[PDB]
Amino acid sequence: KTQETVQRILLEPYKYLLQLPGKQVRTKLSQAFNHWLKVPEDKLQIIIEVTEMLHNASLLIDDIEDNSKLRRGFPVAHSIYGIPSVINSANYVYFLGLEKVLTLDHQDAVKLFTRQLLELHQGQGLDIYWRDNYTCPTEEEYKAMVLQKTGGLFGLAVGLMQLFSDYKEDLKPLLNTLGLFFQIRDDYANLHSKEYSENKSFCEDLTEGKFSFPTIHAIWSRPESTQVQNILCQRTENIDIKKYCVHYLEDVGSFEYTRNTLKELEAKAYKQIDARGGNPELVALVKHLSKMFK
Amino acid sequence: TQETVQRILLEPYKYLLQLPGKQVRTKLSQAFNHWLKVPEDKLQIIIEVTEMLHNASLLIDDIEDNSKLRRGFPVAHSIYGIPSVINSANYVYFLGLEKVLTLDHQDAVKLFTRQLLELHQGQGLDIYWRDNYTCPTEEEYKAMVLQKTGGLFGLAVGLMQLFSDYKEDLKPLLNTLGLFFQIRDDYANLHSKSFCEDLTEGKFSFPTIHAIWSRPESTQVQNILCQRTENIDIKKYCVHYLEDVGSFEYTRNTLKELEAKAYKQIDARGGNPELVALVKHLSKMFK
Amino acid sequence: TQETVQRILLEPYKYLLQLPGKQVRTKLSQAFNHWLKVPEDKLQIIIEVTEMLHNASLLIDDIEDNSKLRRGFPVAHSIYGIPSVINSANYVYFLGLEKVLTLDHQDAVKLFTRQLLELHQGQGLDIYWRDNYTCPTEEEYKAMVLQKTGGLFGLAVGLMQLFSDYKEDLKPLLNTLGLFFQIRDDYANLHSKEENKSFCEDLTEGKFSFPTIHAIWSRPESTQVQNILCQRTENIDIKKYCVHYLEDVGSFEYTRNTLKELEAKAYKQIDARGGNPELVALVKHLSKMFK
Amino acid sequence: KTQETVQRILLEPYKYLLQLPGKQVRTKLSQAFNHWLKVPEDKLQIIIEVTEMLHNASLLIDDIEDNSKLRRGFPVAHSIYGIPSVINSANYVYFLGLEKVLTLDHQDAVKLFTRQLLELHQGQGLDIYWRDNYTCPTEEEYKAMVLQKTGGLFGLAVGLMQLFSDYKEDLKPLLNTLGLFFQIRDDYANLHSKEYSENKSFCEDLTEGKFSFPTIHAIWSRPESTQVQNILCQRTENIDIKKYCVHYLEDVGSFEYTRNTLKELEAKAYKQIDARGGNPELVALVKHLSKMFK
Amino acid sequence: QETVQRILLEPYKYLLQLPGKQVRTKLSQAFNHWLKVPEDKLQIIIEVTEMLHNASLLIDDIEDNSKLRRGFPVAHSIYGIPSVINSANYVYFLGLEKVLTLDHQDAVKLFTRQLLELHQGQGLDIYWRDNYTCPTEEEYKAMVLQKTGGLFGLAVGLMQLFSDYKEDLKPLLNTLGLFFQIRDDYANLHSKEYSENKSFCEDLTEGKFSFPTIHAIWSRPESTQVQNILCQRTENIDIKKYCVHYLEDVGSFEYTRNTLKELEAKAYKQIDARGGNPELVALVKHLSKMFKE
Amino acid sequence: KTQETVQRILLEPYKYLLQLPGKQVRTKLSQAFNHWLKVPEDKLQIIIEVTEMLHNASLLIDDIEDNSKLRRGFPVAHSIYGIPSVINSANYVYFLGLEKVLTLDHQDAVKLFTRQLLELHQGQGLDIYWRDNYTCPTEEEYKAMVLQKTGGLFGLAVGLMQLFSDYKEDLKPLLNTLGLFFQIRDDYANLHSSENKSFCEDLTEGKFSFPTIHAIWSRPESTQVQNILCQRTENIDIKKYCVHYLEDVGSFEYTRNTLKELEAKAYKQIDARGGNPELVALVKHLSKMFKEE
Ligand SMILES: CC(C)=CCC/C(C)=C/CC/C(C)=C/CC/C(C)=C/COP(=O)(O)OP(=O)(O)O
Ligand SMILES: CC(C)=CCC/C(C)=C/CC/C(C)=C/CC/C(C)=C/COP(=O)(O)OP(=O)(O)O
Ligand SMILES: CC(C)=CCC/C(C)=C/CC/C(C)=C/CC/C(C)=C/COP(=O)(O)OP(=O)(O)O
Ligand SMILES: CC(C)=CCC/C(C)=C/CC/C(C)=C/CC/C(C)=C/COP(=O)(O)OP(=O)(O)O
Ligand SMILES: CC(C)=CCC/C(C)=C/CC/C(C)=C/CC/C(C)=C/COP(=O)(O)OP(=O)(O)O
Ligand SMILES: CC(C)=CCC/C(C)=C/CC/C(C)=C/CC/C(C)=C/COP(=O)(O)OP(=O)(O)O
Ligand SMILES: [Mg+2]
Ligand SMILES: [Mg+2]
Ligand SMILES: [Mg+2]
Ligand SMILES: [Mg+2]
Ligand SMILES: [Mg+2]
Ligand SMILES: [Mg+2]
Ligand SMILES: [Mg+2]
Ligand SMILES: [Mg+2]
Ligand SMILES: [Mg+2]
Ligand SMILES: [Mg+2]
Ligand SMILES: [Mg+2]
Ligand SMILES: [Mg+2]
């Protein structure tokens, strides 16, 4: 009882994040991949749970590292329970996720767990490095980073599923395109949506001072102006300053450029699904997510 | 190569390696090896894993405790920033797990998970009580310390036990030692980190817990802890009060009692001159 | 102009007189006079005395509560500063005692002292619970409200009874109305956003109001409310989450039913004292919020 | 059992200030003035209690209005229990003091309590007015206010004692001289004393931004400079700015002027005491208090 | 060459995107109807004026802690206070370099004189505000005539150095200076309808004594509200809305409008006494449209 | 009328800085160079005042741009009178100094004044740009910037003197060596100690000074210094750590040797112009900072 109550007190920040939207995409994603994997439901429930645990845990930590205010329209967990509480709680879930990952009875599972998490930390580390050392990455550099940030859990889930699946053709190429698709879509939405209130508040990325795909464009597209770089350094919440930044980004074509990149990423993804036999479920998701641009 | 990433991510950890402390961990490892006698090949990995996880947790704890100094050095997030150190410290955790996967023992990762979760339970209660303003009892407090310290204490000795025919119980001594360390650390943080950094943290340390429960007609300590202030005089006031209600003598008396329990447990396990000397060296503070 | 100092010290108080509220106080005094039938010379003194202390206490309360708006107006310390408002509000307390010394009744200062100490006890517990992070129970809260509100209510009605032949006990109703008023205030400060205070200013104060108290004890598996209250945050998004939780746990319905029950109980008490058409109407008007 | 527990919890901030030194000086004052008033111990004890209670409550409120950090070497009560709690507690003691005055069985006590209290608040208001409205007063204006701030509590004690005394000789002139002597000595010490935290912290008056006797001199003595006014507006805790201000005050002779004013106040007190029959106890007190500016 | 000038002139380039050059241009045209300045000199004078004028607004925004100018973020809100300080002072001396191309022995003399006048005006405005000393109406106007007269006199004065028109225009320049500032003061507080220039009642957040506020302060000396609100330098929308309600209720806005209406009339008469200026008359009529509502 | 009260109000921050030590070195510097230029005392006196005004004015502005707390042991002027007043006051003195330069009666004086001031603003801008855009410069880039920051006022003084001197030999190389000597010596003291600024105020400013610059490039495997500079922290313990790091990577030793080299080069340059015992003594006295004994 004391143990179960003491645990309960510690998992509260995680319980809060469970109320946020997102499981739908995670659930649909797993189903889409199983059209190829045909993996036992018994193991999947574990892998599904493990993925949800590690994913939400990373988002709890990410909100702290990004000084974000809103997530999926909800206050971020550390806005309520406090940063020291959420840090320990999220880290508790990491090793709770290993405990569940220790039940797949596959000797190669723990290896994939460790590898995928270290890969995830590499990406987040680089994003935090560039932002907090005021060094804008190049378009190529940014893309490389997300492939480790997104690729960490994408490969963790898909990989653990493949451990008990007879499908064995390489799925890393498609996962990378999707990882790009999600983050760049995330970047486009965080700055192009006004009061849609889909996930975060108005241009929360500018207040974080982070380098997202649109801002990265304007920085290199227009090396004759240092406006964006200076505005990001301010890490300000001033709406007028943020509104100016967005107008400039449109004027330099950063938003139009991002849309075409997102539009291009969708096309490549379609081919990758088709080259693996086709995935009516996975193909459908992309079309739904593609409603954001144009 | 792209190996500049590892350097970038491990810089905050590399910074903390410059701090004193490895001597105590090494001497502790050697002292327990007089009984465990683990093959050096495995032992080498065990020490590395222990040092990584210990330092990695200490990076995170300083963030959770809003601490300013550690063993006389600035905290890592005071230099590299909280976001970077968080990612780096979590990075080292899982690098440490990778290293445990080189011990080639089916029960190694099992001990790893259990001990690590045990540490998080201890930290959680320490954080929960402090951030929900509910001072624990001595029993509740000591019970928490037994998991916080026991997390890393049992990890090392446990991993050492994984490759040793010495199967005698060291947990009583491990629990006595973990208690000894924290209560000792609590005592030092207030009787000697910057001036009373624990008071600025607002944490319930062993000395403060005594006065809170000892003289319940005053809520002074509780309120001072809630302010989480950096005022030297306010901090100076608290320690004088703690001293006047005997909170420090009580901590010393508990420490002196803890010292005896360790000595008796050491002799009851055959004796460990290296260990006994180490404890004696640490026991000089409450003399 | 001789001691123009009075003007300097009374400026914050004059600022608060511009705020709505006197109507309820006037109508309340009128309703009770239907039973007490107080001499106009004495009643007028009591009315001023009541207004002074009531406004003075609200000035102090706004400071202790870090409030931003009162009845749609900036709080006085938002303009003249916290030190000035403290001194002036304490000045008005003791100006009121001077005025009570004109009621001639030897027991007036005694009534004044007791009623004021009771009000300070109520505010103290409200402050104690909030600033020592210990949520009270419903009974504990209600006991406190009966001391906070009972302080000025009993002083007014009490002073009137000193010069009245109606010697029947009115304290049960005074307590019922006091709870009614505070619990009604608690409901609105969180159920609306406009009018009086700003959006959920009580959550930013971190104080335990009736709706929050319910949610805290109703669902002991969650510490959200406690933690949100500890943040003393001004984030609208966090506050919107808090009310949503309060609504989803039924704390708002519980407050309405508690208020509706208090309204009914009041009616029973009014009739038991002969009936008071004026007072019955006041209650009915104030009850329109629970819909 | 209950309610009395509430009184204890609500009176704690007051109990904390009782640990502070000072009761001795208040006690010696009561004894010294009673050499003339010869008040019955039955009444005197309450007058002493009423005086001590209201004074400490006023010092609690004063510390909040003055953003003070230390009083008599101890942290200010609101630095421990918080401003909202101390306010309610001090005002609670105010009316607790009134309850005590209702035990003198003299009907003119309630009048005196009211009058002296209103007088004190007038002084406090003006001091706060000048400071928070950035309007330095004249020397005459400052002294006029001090006679109301000190006289409020001074007149309460001596006056209440005189209600039960056959003396009936006019003592207000002496109380006024003592009132000035006390404040000007406080003003001088808060700025001239070493970094020695005997009462308040280093030049806490400059951080308060208040117009104390020394600063008042420099402002009018040298009207070609706005240094002092500008430093007081900053309300800084910068040691270097504060040390510079004291350097300026010394160079314009403000500290010497304050000493000479205090030396005169002491001399006048001797003459005033002599004119009322003499008071060896009071003479000893002033001589002891005068050792600081000598 | 390594013209690092671009890096240093970036904050200045940022402010050129703001509206305003049109009004400065129309003023030049209106006054050239009398002065008839040679085109070669006039073009430079226009450039010198635009440089020094924008440079002063860069410095002023820092001194006034403003948030918006002409609907745009203030330059130091992006590039930072240290950069804009150095950049605006750089442009001052770039303007001096330019004024030396008029080849007039008195141009630098007039330049120095006019800039010192502007700093006297700016200093007094800053002095009263940061020493919490409200000026009297006459005192306020005297400062405005020095603040505005600084650039007004530099432009027209430099033009007159190359003009056969030698009639005194300073009386008209003073009227226009007052008209400009008081119009600005009124708009910053009465035009809550739009964020066309500054943000909502930024003058109250600056704590400056503007014409509307000055009236209420002296008109109602039994109240210290305005003074106290200005001392708070608060960004509270509710406190600001209260101040405007108070200002309107004591007639400070009506008083300001009547003063502006009078300044408009005086300007028309002064223009006619100088021969008439259809161009200038049109500008005043257009600028007078804000308070005629 | 006769309101020199405005002047007092506007010049109070400037008069405050005159109480600070510093005039002595400037006086000795003027004397050392007059041993070659031999300028009429009437012209010399004006040149000295112009230099004193412009130099002090820039330091008032510089302290604002550098968030400095102390100067020469005294609080910075804006810590007392406020940033807005000091900015306006300091810019006022610039234009007062221009007025004074108009009294040297040389047709090229204003030209030299303008040119030198633009150069100083070029240097300061580069210093601020690197700091507020978090991009450490190279040693060569830094040295080039210092030649414009110091060169502005060094060349203004010496340049103005040479306008009234028959000594027409080139002093810019020596002027540049001394400019570097002065800045790098200040950098050394701000971290290793000069009874000037507060403890490692340069770390709190986040500026790239010569010692820090070394550590940045000397050990490029570490981002410690850059990150510490970005924190813009006032923590004495963090500052003390940086100093330990700087010493352990040899940044202080490298700075000392660079200064010793500048000292020798200065002596060689001085001898090359005929010798200057006065100037040689100044360098020797200032060089005691980087000597063990
Ligand atoms: C295939 C199955 C069964 C599940 C999918 C596995 C999943 C959901 C992997 C997560 C995909 C992803 C994009 C992970 C990134 C996690 C993370 C912490 C991203 C941080 O991105 P930021 O842009 O820095 O922060 P925001 O999300 O607030 O924008
Ligand atoms: C015995 C062998 C072979 C090795 C030693 C094994 C280890 C690492 C022992 C260390 C035990 C210990 C003291 C663990 C504490 C971990 C932790 C979370 C400390 C944080 O404690 P706080 O209460 O926050 O106070 P400090 O910040 O001063 O640490
Ligand atoms: C004359 C008659 C018949 C009645 C007089 C009417 C009076 C004086 C009523 C007072 C009743 C009341 C509600 C008193 C409250 C006083 C007080 C300290 C209010 C502040 O408490 P909070 O809990 O902070 O609520 P608010 O912040 O909304 O004010
Ligand atoms: C004469 C007898 C028998 C008794 C007198 C006992 C008392 C209470 C005398 C009053 C003495 C006095 C100086 C009262 C002043 C009241 C007060 C709150 C002054 C505070 O003014 P500040 O300028 O803030 O100075 P401090 O904050 O340093 O105290
Ligand atoms: C007549 C010709 C040919 C040209 C005139 C062109 C110009 C620039 C005339 C000067 C116009 C003017 C009013 C200048 C004042 C500059 C200044 C320092 C304004 C600052 O006043 P604030 O009170 O700060 O109000 P804002 O900050 O909103 O501008
Ligand atoms: C040579 C003769 C005849 C006279 C002396 C002429 C002068 C005053 C030369 C001054 C050279 C010098 C040191 C110029 C630098 C001025 C400046 C803008 C310094 C600011 O740079 P910082 O690095 O911030 O210096 P601080 O550390 O003092 O703030
Ligand atoms: Mg992130
Ligand atoms: Mg994020
Ligand atoms: Mg901890
Ligand atoms: Mg800690
Ligand atoms: Mg309240
Ligand atoms: Mg309230
Ligand atoms: Mg005071
Ligand atoms: Mg005081
Ligand atoms: Mg301005
Ligand atoms: Mg302005
Ligand atoms: Mg600089
Ligand atoms: Mg500097």
DSSP H or E run through E143: helix E137-160
Task: Give me the helices (H) in E17-80, please.
Answer: 21-35, 39-63, 76-79
b/e per residue, F134-150, with b = 16+ CB within 10 A? bebbeeeebbebbbbbb
Q: How far apart are CA F7 and CA E293, in angstroms?
A: 41
For A62, A138, B8, F288, the CA distances from A127, given in Å and listed in that order, are 11, 12, 11, 47
Q: What separation in Å is there between the alpha carbon of C243 and the centre of ligand 11?
A: 20
Q: Cβ of D177: how many Cβ atoms within 10 Å? A: 22
| Residue ID of nearest Cα to ligand 3 atom 13 | C149
Q: Does the beta carbon of F49 lie inside 6 Å of ligand 6?
A: no
**What are the DSSP calls for E71-110, one per residue?**
TEEPTHHHH-HHHHHHHHHHHHHHHHHHHTTS--TTHHHH
Is A26 annotated as a binding-site member? Answer: yes
Which residue shows structure tokens 């990612």?
B87
Spatial neighbors of F119 by CB under 8 A, at least 6 apart, are F148, F151, F152, F155
DSSP H or E run through A75: strand A74-75
Probe residue for ligand 1, chosen from A93, A120, A132, A150 as the CB with the greatest number of ligand atoms within 8 Å? A150
F70: three-class secondary structure by DSSP = strand
- Our CA angle for D135, D140, D144, nearest 5°, is 90
Q: Does residue A294 sit within a domain? A: no
A179: three-class secondary structure by DSSP = helix
Among A147, A41, A156, A152, smallest CA distance to A108 is for A156
**Interface contact flag, E8 F111, Cβ < 8 Å:** no
Query: At CB < 8 Å, which residues of chain E contact A?
Result: 10, 14, 67-68, 72-73, 77-80, 199
Which residue shows structure tokens 């009211």?
D114
Probe residue for ligand 2, chosen from B153, B225, B272 as the CB with the greatest number of ligand atoms within 8 Å? B153
What distance in Å separates residue B74's CA from the closest CA in chain D? 24
CB A30 within 8 A of CB A48: yes
Is F232 annotated as a binding-site member? Answer: no
Residue E80 Ramachandran class (φ > 0 left, ψ -120 to 50 alpha, else beta) = left
Chain E positions in Cβ-Cβ contact with residue D132 (cut-off 8 Å): 231
Which residue shows structure tokens 């009547």?
E258
F75: three-class secondary structure by DSSP = strand
E169: three-class secondary structure by DSSP = coil
Q: Which chains touch D (3 or more CB pairs under 8 A)?
A: B, C, E, F
Across B147-223, the runs of DSSP E, i.e. the strands, are: none
Q: Does the beta carbon of F62 lie inside 6 Å of ligand 6?
A: yes
Q: How far apart are CA A91 and CA A88, in angstroms?
A: 5
Q: Does the beta carbon of A153 lie inside 6 Å of ligand 1?
A: yes
What is the CATH classification number for the domain harbouring C223? 1.10.600.10
Q: How far apart are CA E49 and CA D32, in angstroms?
A: 77
Is C54 annotated as a binding-site member? Answer: yes
Chain B positions in Cβ-Cβ contact with residue F224 (cut-off 8 Å): 15, 79
Q: What separation in Å is there between the alpha carbon of C126 and the centre of ligand 11?
A: 7
Q: Does residue D45 sit within a domain? A: yes
| Residue ID of nearest Cα to ligand 5 atom 11 | E148
**Helix D254-275 with D213-221: angle, nearest 10 deg:** 120
Q: Are residues B147 and B283 in the same domain?
A: no
Chain D positions in Cβ-Cβ contact with residue B233 (cut-off 8 Å): 69-70, 75, 197, 201
Q: Cβ of A225: how many Cβ atoms within 10 Å? A: 16
Spatial neighbors of D241 by CB under 8 A, at least 6 apart, are D206, D231, D234, F75, F79, F80
Q: How far apart are CA E174 and CA A220, in angstroms?
A: 49
Q: Does residue A126 sit within a domain? A: yes
Question: What counts of helices (H) and strands (E) characterise chain F?
Answer: 14, 2
CB B275 within 8 A of CB B34: yes
Distance linking the first and last C-alpha atoms of chain E:
54
| Residue ID of nearest Cα to ligand 6 atom 3 | F30
Q: What separation in Å is there between the alpha carbon of B149 and the centre of ligand 2?
A: 5
Probe residue for ligand 4, chosen from D154, D162, D178 as the CB with the greatest number of ligand atoms within 8 Å? D154
Among F112, F117, F158, smallest CA distance to F279 is for F158
Spatial neighbors of C171 by CB under 8 A, at least 6 apart, are C150, C154
Q: Does residue E182 sit within a domain? A: yes
From D230, D231, D240, residue closest to F69, measured CB to CB: D240
Q: Are residues B235 and B218 in the same domain?
A: yes
CB A153 within 8 A of CB A55: yes
Q: Are residues B246 and B230 in the same domain?
A: yes
CB B34 within 8 A of CB B276: no
CB-facing half-sphere around the CA of F140: CA atoms within 13 A: 0
Where among B116, B131, B164 does a domain terminate? B164
Q: How many residues does chain F have?
A: 293
Q: How far apart are CA B146 and CA B175, in angstroms?
A: 6
Q: How far apart are CA B36 and CA D214, in angstroms?
A: 75
Among A286, A291, A289, A290, smallest CA distance to A271 is for A286
Probe residue for ligand 1, chosen from A154, A191, A282 as the CB with the greatest number of ligand atoms within 8 Å? A154
Q: What separation in Å is there between the alpha carbon of D55 and the centre of ligand 4?
A: 7
Q: How far apart are CA E245 and CA E247, in angstroms?
A: 6
Please, what's the largest Cα pairwise distance for chain E?
65
Q: Does the beta carbon of C50 lie inside 6 Å of ligand 3?
A: yes
Atom number in ligand 5 closest to CA E208: 23
Burial of B34 (0-12, 13-18, 19+ CB in 10 A): middle
Among D185, D260, D258, D176, smallest CA distance to D215 is for D258
CB-facing half-sphere around the CA of F170: CA atoms within 13 A: 4
Q: How far apart are CA E214 and CA E182, in angstroms?
A: 11
Spatial neighbors of A162 by CB under 8 A, at least 6 apart, are A37, A168, A171
| Residue ID of nearest Cα to ligand 1 atom 23 | A183
> Tokens in use for C256?
């309405």
**Interface contact flag, A87 B86, Cβ < 8 Å:** yes
Q: Are residues B149 and B185 in the same domain?
A: no
Where among B112, B145, B164 does a domain terminate? B164
Ligand lying closest to the C-alpha of residue D157: 4
The partner residues of D71 in beta bridges, in order of sequence, read D74
Burial of C140 (0-12, 13-18, 19+ CB in 10 A): middle
Is C27 annotated as a binding-site member? Answer: no
CB F173 within 8 A of CB F228: no
Spatial neighbors of C104 by CB under 8 A, at least 6 apart, are none
Spatial neighbors of C118 by CB under 8 A, at least 6 apart, are C147, C150, C151, C154
Q: Cβ of A173: how many Cβ atoms within 10 Å? A: 14
| Residue ID of nearest Cα to ligand 1 atom 15 | A150
What distance in Å separates residue F260's CA from the closest CA in chain E? 30
Q: Does the beta carbon of C255 lie inside 6 Å of ligand 3?
A: no
Q: How far apart are CA A9 and CA A19, in angstroms?
A: 17
Question: What residue of B is the nearest CA neighbor of D83?
Answer: B227
Q: How far apart are CA D198 and CA D72, in angstroms?
A: 6
Among B225, C154, C129, smallest CA distance to D6 is for C129
Ligand lying closest to the C-alpha of residue C127: 11
Spatial neighbors of A70 by CB under 8 A, at least 6 apart, are A76, A197, A199, A200, A201, A204, C237
Technique employed here was X-ray
List residues near ligand 4 (CB under 6 A): D 26, 29-30, 33, 51, 55, 58-59, 62, 66, 68, 149-150, 153-154, 157-158, 182-183, 186
Number of domains within chain D: 1
What distance in Å separates residue D204's CA from the closest CA in chain B? 14
For C217, F49, F50, F173, the CA distances from F161, given in Å and listed in that order, are 85, 12, 11, 17
Q: Are residues B152 and B275 in the same domain?
A: no
Which residue segment(s) compose the domain that C241 sits in?
5-290
Is F256 annotated as a binding-site member? Answer: no
Where among B147, B164, B181 does a domain terminate? B164
List residues near ligand 2 (CB under 6 A): B 25, 28-29, 32, 50, 54, 57, 61, 65, 67, 123, 126, 148-149, 152-153, 156-157, 178, 181, 185
Q: Cβ of A12: how many Cβ atoms within 10 Å? A: 21
What distance in Å separates residue E224's CA from the closest CA in chain D? 9
Q: Does residue D116 sit within a domain? A: yes
Q: Does the beta carbon of A62 lie inside 6 Å of ligand 1?
A: yes
> Tokens in use for E80?
């930072």
Is C237 annotated as a binding-site member? Answer: no
**What are the DSSP calls for E185-197, one per residue?**
HHHHHH-TT--SS
Which residue shows structure tokens 């919107």?
C240
Is C207 annotated as a binding-site member? Answer: yes
Residue F72 per-residue DSSP state: T
Q: How far apart are CA B234 and CA B202, in angstroms?
A: 13
Please, what's the largest Cα pairwise distance for chain F?
67
Q: Does the beta carbon of C57 lie inside 6 Å of ligand 3?
A: yes
Among B115, B24, B12, smallest CA distance to B56 is for B12
**Helix E170-190 with E137-160: angle, nearest 10 deg:** 130
Q: How far apart are CA E26 and CA E283, in angstroms?
A: 8
Chain B contact probe: residue of A2, A96, A114 with most B CBs at under 10 A:
A114
Q: Does the beta carbon of C152 lie inside 6 Å of ligand 3?
A: yes
Chain D positions in Cβ-Cβ contact with residue F69 (cut-off 8 Å): 238, 240
Q: Are residues B138 and B234 in the same domain?
A: no
Q: Which chains touch A (3 or more CB pairs under 8 A)?
A: B, C, E, F
Contacts 24+ apart (CB under 8 A), E169-172: E169/E31, E169/E34, E169/E274, E171/E270, E172/E267, E172/E270, E172/E271, E172/E274
- In one-letter notation, the amino acid at residue B215 is R
Task: Give me the helices (H) in A66-171, please.
Answer: 83-101, 109-132, 139-162
Q: Does residue D294 sit within a domain? A: no
Q: How far apart are CA F225 and CA F206, in angstroms?
A: 10
Do chains C and B meet with 3 or more Cβ pairs nearer than 8 Å?
A: yes
Q: How many residues does chain B have?
A: 287
List residues in chain C that are followed by a break over 2.5 Å (C to N).
194
DSSP H or E run through A71: strand A70-71
**Helix C210-218 with C251-272: angle, nearest 10 deg:** 120
Q: Does residue E62 sit within a domain? A: yes
Q: How far apart are CA A255 and CA A277, in angstroms?
A: 34
> Tokens in use for B203?
């944490």
For A77, A216, E98, the CA distances from A226, given in Å and listed in that order, are 35, 12, 27
A292: three-class secondary structure by DSSP = coil
Residue C103 per-residue DSSP state: S
b/e per residue, E103-121, with b = 16+ CB within 10 A? eeeebbebbbbbbbbbbbb
Q: How far apart are CA F188 and CA F253, in angstroms?
A: 10
Q: Does residue E293 sit within a domain? A: no
Three-state secondary structure string covering chain D: CCCHHHHHHHHHHHHHHHCCCCHHHHHHHHHHHHHHHCCCHHHHHHHHHHHHHHHHHHHHHHHHHCCCCEECCEECHHHCCCHHHHHHHHHHHHHHHHHHHCCCCCHHHHHHHHHHHHHHHHHHHHHHHHHHCCCCCCHHHHHHHHHHHHHHHHHHHHHHHHCCCCCCCCCHHHHHHHHHHHHHHHHHHHHHCCCCCCCCCCCHHHHHCCCCHHHHHHHHHCCCCCHHHHHHHHCCCCHHHHHHHHHHHHHCCHHHHHHHHHHHHHHHHHHHHHHCCCCHHHHHHHHHHCCCCC
Q: How far apart are CA C72 and CA D212, in angstroms?
A: 38
Q: How far apart are CA B105 and CA A113, in angstroms?
A: 17
CB D215 within 8 A of CB D254: yes
For C247, E199, E226, the CA distances from E210, given in Å and listed in that order, are 48, 16, 11
- In one-letter notation, the amino acid at residue D118 is L
Which residue shows structure tokens 């990373």?
A58
Among E127, D229, E95, smallest CA distance to F87 is for E127
